[PDB]
Amino acid sequence: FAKLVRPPVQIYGIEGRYATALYSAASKQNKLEQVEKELLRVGQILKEPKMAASLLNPYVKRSVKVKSLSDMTAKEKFSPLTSNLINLLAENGRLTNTPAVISAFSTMMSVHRGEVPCTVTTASALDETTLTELKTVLKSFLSKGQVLKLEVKIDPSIMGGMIVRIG
Template sequence: MNYVSHNASEFTYFFCDQLSCAEVDLQSLKKMAALGLGLQVRQFSTSVLRQALIRPPIDVYGVGGRYATALFSAASKQKKLEQVEKEMGTLSALIKDPKLSSIVMNPHVKRSLKLKFFGDAMTKANLSPITVNLVSVLADNGRLTLTADVVGAFAKMMSAHRGEVICTVTTAHPLDEANLAELKVALNGFLAKGETLILETKSDASILGGMIVSIGDKYVDMSTKTKIHKLTKIIRDS
């Protein structure tokens, strides 16, 4: 049985169910069953625990990325990727609600109370068991504050699933139409067949000039600010 330990007394098992391969300890399973949130507690065989995880087209690192990967796998197996993607939008709106957020994000509020309020909100929103179970696991592991990270990571995975390549370009000043068109032509040259460029441009006067390009898993800093820093370091070290 595969597991990792966060501390000497807590063992976190990876399980494959409606929310595949997400973190949950045995005590968490019992609590979630008591809350009646649809996660069936049962003995998982070694073969089930090692059930193949359907990997997303891109890896998103961090704890949020790990939960999003589990969510992507679970939704893929149930052929509900698009439905869950829409529900992530609803979930994002819920955590931005001032009243709900003041409870869910408050470290002094008990987890059981947070989950009750969140559960009531999800019931009203008619969210699927996959999404409900995601929130259940996050709540029981004290990670509801990472909900936005999970939603963001899942959005990136779905974008890649559709063949979209997100590119962010930061310049000191807004690009005019001619330069923007030229930039798009250059960036499209990096795409594989069937991929679509999703370009986002930002302005940041602090970079002084040049540009910073983030495309897929690549990051290139060609800003004047960075060039000056490198030149200054060379002069100081010489």
């Protein structure tokens, strides 16, 4: 078919199946971020009880719901694909899935471009860098607190077991 633009982050299926649609869609025309953000915006235009109340509720039993949220709410400026892909997820119920689809996306211009090292000493602050072991020390000026959430406690752990480990 149309060869597909599978630039990871993404999630590979799992509304990576979705995401990757827009990893080829947004991507072509490079509304990648344009739309990446449409979604962000959208999200919370959702997250009020449009969201519970009919949005993820069908009690009407989605059938008319999907034929009224295609048009009462999907009715927006967020629409080059944005509402249309909504209008795709809708029937296809993946509305309940959306945070994750967005997530999947958003991890793209926002974090595709991220960071990740995680040893037992690390637990990266994931800052957005295309290169490595650099920023990774700037971190030491970052270094000034935590329970060693981003990067680790190496105390109870490393070491603490060790005495045990000998006996």
